[PDB]
Amino acid sequence: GKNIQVVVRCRPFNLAERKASAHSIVECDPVRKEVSVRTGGLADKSSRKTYTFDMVFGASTKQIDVYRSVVCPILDEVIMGYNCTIFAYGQTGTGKTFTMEGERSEEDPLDGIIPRTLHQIFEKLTDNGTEFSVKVSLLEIYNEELFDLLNPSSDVSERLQMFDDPRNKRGVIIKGLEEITVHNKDEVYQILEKGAAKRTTAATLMNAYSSRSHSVFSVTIHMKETTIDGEELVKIGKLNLVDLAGSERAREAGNINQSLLTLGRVITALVERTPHVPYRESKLTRILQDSLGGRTRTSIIATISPASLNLEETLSTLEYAHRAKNILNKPE
Amino acid sequence: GKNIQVVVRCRPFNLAERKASAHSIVECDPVRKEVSVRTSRKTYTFDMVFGASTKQIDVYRSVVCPILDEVIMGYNCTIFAYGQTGTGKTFTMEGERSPEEDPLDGIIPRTLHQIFEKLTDNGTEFSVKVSLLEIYNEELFDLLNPSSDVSERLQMFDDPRNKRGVIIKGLEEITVHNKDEVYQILEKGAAKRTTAATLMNAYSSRSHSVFSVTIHMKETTIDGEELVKIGKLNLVDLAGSENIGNQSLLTLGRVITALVERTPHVPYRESKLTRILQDSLGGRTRTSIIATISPASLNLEETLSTLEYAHRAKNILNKPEV
Ligand SMILES: Nc1ncnc2c1ncn2[C@@H]1O[C@H](COP(=O)(O)OP(=O)(O)O)[C@@H](O)[C@H]1O
Ligand SMILES: Nc1ncnc2c1ncn2[C@@H]1O[C@H](COP(=O)(O)OP(=O)(O)O)[C@@H](O)[C@H]1O
Ligand SMILES: [Mg+2]
Ligand SMILES: [Mg+2]
């Protein structure tokens, strides 16, 4: 019960889990906001471990219903001119990218957050008369090094440098980052497309895999609203959509442990109001600082597998989400 | 190495791999017997290397035939499939039935078809028995016993005729009276494996699966010799290599290195698996490990780990380049 929402989304079985003879160990109960996992080793059908969250989504949960519960309330905040962040956390293949982006293959029912938010920003702002402009940026953090995914020319190993700008505190300046003007609703798709192809090339040429790196898609809205006898009103607002690296050579994995672990140290600090927030201690936390501790709405989506095969990773991601906002199991 | 062969079989991409837009990170060179992984590039060399287009029949022709010729002479032999869950261990050991021999038949059914075809064709007098057990959490479960219940596990004892040998009390052995009986036999085991996973949580991906075929032979030739023999083939489908980090996989590996390098101690007694199998690993015998891997970037960490395992078990120096 705070500005920090921690929720869990369990995916359906994949084909590999079915080929492996995996069994369902995850039980999701949306009404009690609980998730339990049968933890039993040999001959133990007794032990189950429960966790309670702000929200629990089962495997049959639709995209649009994750959007309506988690994203709408954050968008309103943004439209009022605030900075907010939504994180997808979890094991590779549990649906981080699916939640954040989705796919096409009205509103395409497989759409994730990113295309859906754009469509609403446009629908809402154009309905209520607001004067506005929409900018998006997409970068990637691999090995504590930033890479612009949207820069049309300059396709290379080219890193971006980050400076702590004297101008504003809490903030940071990334020199050279492409910010693209979004001219209309459906334009997200080709922008996601361009970022994709580039992402692919950085996978093959630098072996930087999207499963090993943080993906930050930023949208900024400039709004001007006026009403007769209504006070002309000027607002900027910012929405950060972060698709994290997998939570599951030796050097760079040590690094991804450090960031997620720091991001978590940060979220725990925000929840507790316990001062001294260690934004400093990783690039990711640094890039996002202005949208985090400065009071705001913040959300974490934790993804999980239903299968016995994934039990260790599933428990870790729930141990993690739970260390982030500790909320107690309730009786009965 | 000699009678210890270590080969790799890489499987084709699967769908999750295509849809993730996974990059193929291994090159398998059959001719140079090499597997390379882009990581720069790490290259390993084996006794043989099977690309993703390798058919079951070719694996068998190449790996099994010589091992089986050896079993038919009256010797005990072992073949292991090692690798990550999903890479093809069961596809290699068993195969799949499709909806002349099913081109999708793995080692177990081809071995049984060959034993029958070969031994009746030379007019040898012979009897085939098979047994199937499962190792989970250092405990033995018979998959062929029609009776009892999920929770019953087998006890082994030292064997007074054989110091390298072991007796598993109550292990069910099934006579095979013809070629195809092996299909229904494999089906009984699967049904019981399902039960044990449901009731005991012994999950198949977490379990060593040991399929042993025993052959009794009397071969007679007028003007030649009267030959009495017992052959044994153990076909072992290991637990998923991602569980490494259990010790039984690590012990198996330490035991194979000792055999290849010949160090004074070979630690068979340090796992049920090596214990069970010590009699066919007793050296001067055919032993073969098939290491299975995926080609995709998704699976890299585990593919590297499998290759390291394979390389540590038998360490072959790389030849020179182009
Ligand atoms: N809730 C869900 N419903 C349907 N499909 C899903 C769900 N979550 C994940 N998937 C599917 O699982 C696969 C892997 O998901 P992906 O988002 O690529 O995972 P990650 O970002 O965690 O690596 C994709 O094929 C995606 O369609
Ligand atoms: N070499 C191969 N050629 C064709 N299909 C394969 C191969 N290896 C595995 N497969 C397929 O991949 C899937 C998983 O195989 P499986 O044998 O269950 O792996 P494992 O038992 O090691 O977990 C199955 O659909 C199987 O048919
Ligand atoms: Mg992803
Ligand atoms: Mg298997």
Nearest CA to A235 out of A130, A80, A121 is that of A80
Q: Provide the 3-class DSSP secondary structure of residue A174.
A: strand
CB contact under 8 A, B298 and A45: no
Residue A170 is which amino acid? R
Q: Residue B201: which of B155, B152, B150, B240 has the closest Cα?
A: B150
Please give the resolution of this entry in Å, rounded to 1 decimal. Answer: 2.5
Question: What domain range includes position A85?
Answer: 1-332
Shortest CA distance to B255 belongs to which of B317, B314, B168, B167? B314
Q: What long-range pairs does A253-256 form, CB within 8 A, spacing at least 24?
A: A253/A212, A255/A143, A255/A144, A256/A212, A256/A213
Closest-CA residue to A304 (of A263, A246, A217): A246
Task: Measure B15 CA to nearest chain A CA, in Å.
Answer: 9
**In terms of CA atoms, which chain B residue is nearest residue A21?**
B204
Ligand 4 centre to CA of A36 (Å) is: 27
Helix (H, G, I), strand (E, B) or coil at A12: coil
C-alpha A200 to ligand 2 mean position (Å) = 27
Tell me phi and psi for residue B318, to 5 degrees.
-70, 140
Measured distance CA(B28)–CA(B7) in Å, rounded: 11
Name the residue among B16, B21, B202 with its Cβ closest to that of A200.
B21
Q: What phi and psi, each to the nearest 5 degrees, are found at residue B107? A: -60, -45
Q: How many Cβ atoms sit within 10 Å of the Cβ of residue A144?
A: 15
Instruction: State the angle between helix axes of A113-127 and A72-79 in degrees (0 to 180), rounded to the nearest 10.
Output: 50
Which residues of chain A have a CB within 8 Å of the CB of B21?
200
CB contact under 8 A, A42 and B201: yes
Would you say the CB of residue A12 lies under 6 angstroms from ligand 1? Answer: yes
Asked if the C-beta of B96 comes within 8 angstroms of chain A's C-beta atoms, the answer is no
Nearest CA in chain B to A24: B198
Atom of ligand 1 nearest to the CA of B20: 18
Tell me how far apart the alpha carbons of residues B207 and B187 are, in angstroms, rounded to a whole number: 17
Do residue B201 and residue A21 have CB atoms under 8 angstroms apart?
Answer: no
A275: amino acid identity, one letter: P
The ligand with the least distance to the CA atom of A305 is 1
Q: Does the beta carbon of A251 lie under 8 angstroms from any beta carbon of chain B?
A: no
- For residue A329, what are its two tokens? 């199991």
Asked if residue A51 lies in contact with residue A329, where contact means CB atoms within 8 angstroms, the answer is yes
3-state secondary structure A231-284: CCEEEEEEEEEEECCCCCCHHHHHHHHHHHHHHHHHHHHHHHCCCCCCHHHCHH
Q: Do B201 and A309 touch (CB under 8 A)?
A: no
Q: Which residue of B has its CA nearest to A307?
A: B203
Nearest CA-CA distance, residue B21 and chain A, Å: 8
> What is the Cα–Cα distance from A173 to A168, expressed in whole angstroms?
10
Burial class (CB in 10 A: 0-12, 13-18, 19+), B224: exposed
CA distance to A150, B10, B26, B168, per residue, from B7 (Å) = 44, 10, 15, 30
| CATH value at residue B189 | 3.40.850.10
Hey, are the CB atoms on B198 and A44 less than 8 Å from each other? no
Distance in Å, CA A92 to ligand 1 centroid:
9
From the list B23, B39, B151, the residue facing A249 with the nearest CB is B39
Element (H, E) at B247: helix B247-261
Coil/strand/helix, residue A180: strand
By C-alpha distance, which of B210, B309, B208, B313 is closest to B255? B313
Give chain A positions within 8 Å (CB) of B199. 43, 45
Q: Whose CA is nearest to atom 2 of ligand 1?
A: A11
B199/B98 Cα distance (integer angstroms): 30
Name the token pair of A7.
Answer: 């929720």
Determine contact, residues B237/B164, Cβ cutoff 8 Å.
Answer: no
Q: For atom 14 of ligand 1, which residue has the closest CA?
A: A93
Q: Please, which contacts does B43-46 make with residues 24 or more away whose CB atoms are closer than 8 Å?
A: B43/B318, B44/B8, B44/B307, B44/B310, B44/B311, B44/B316, B44/B318, B45/B316, B45/B317, B45/B318, B45/B319, B46/B6, B46/B7, B46/B8, B46/B291, B46/B310, B46/B314, B46/B316
**CB-ligand 2 contact for B51 (6 Å cutoff):** no
Burial of A133 (0-12, 13-18, 19+ CB in 10 A): middle
Provide the pairing of β-strand A4-10 with B41-45.
unpaired
Nearest CA distance, A202 vs chain B (angstrom): 11
Residue having the nearest C-alpha atom to atom 2 of ligand 2: B11
Query: Which atom of ligand 1 is the closest one to the Cα of A10?
Result: 1
Whole-number Å distance between alpha carbons of B311 and B43 = 10
B15 vs A contacts (CB less than 8 Å): 15
* Number of domains observed in the structure of chain A: 1
Distance of alpha carbon B13 from alpha carbon A332, whole angstroms: 48
- In angstroms, what CA-CA distances link A330 with A50, A62, A327, B21? 10, 27, 9, 43
Tell me the best of A98, A213, A317 to mutate to test the pocket of ligand 1, counting ligand atoms within 8 Å of each CB and taking the most.
A98
Neighbouring residues of B4: CB distance < 8 A, sequence distance ≥ 6 = B256, B259, B260, B287, B288, B314
Q: Is A200 on the interface with B (CB under 8 A)?
A: yes
Q: Solved by what technique?
A: X-ray
Task: Give the distance between the most distant pair of CA atoms in chain A.
Answer: 73
Between CA B129 and CA B173 the distance in angstroms is: 6
Closest residue in A to B200 (Cα–Cα): A43
B246 touches chain A (CB under 8 A): no
User: CB-based contact (8 Å) between A15 and chain B?
Assistant: yes
Ligand 2 atom at shortest distance from the alpha carbon of B83: 22
**A21/B239 Cα distance (integer angstroms):** 13
Nearest by CB: A42 against B139, B194, B298? B139
Q: Where are the beta strands (DSSP E) in A118-191?
A: 131-141, 146-148, 162-163, 173-174, 180-182
Determine whether the shortest distance from the Cβ of A94 to ligand 1 is under 6 A.
Answer: yes
Beta-carbon separation of B39 and A14 below 8 A: no
| CA torsion through residues B97, B127, B73, B116, sign | negative
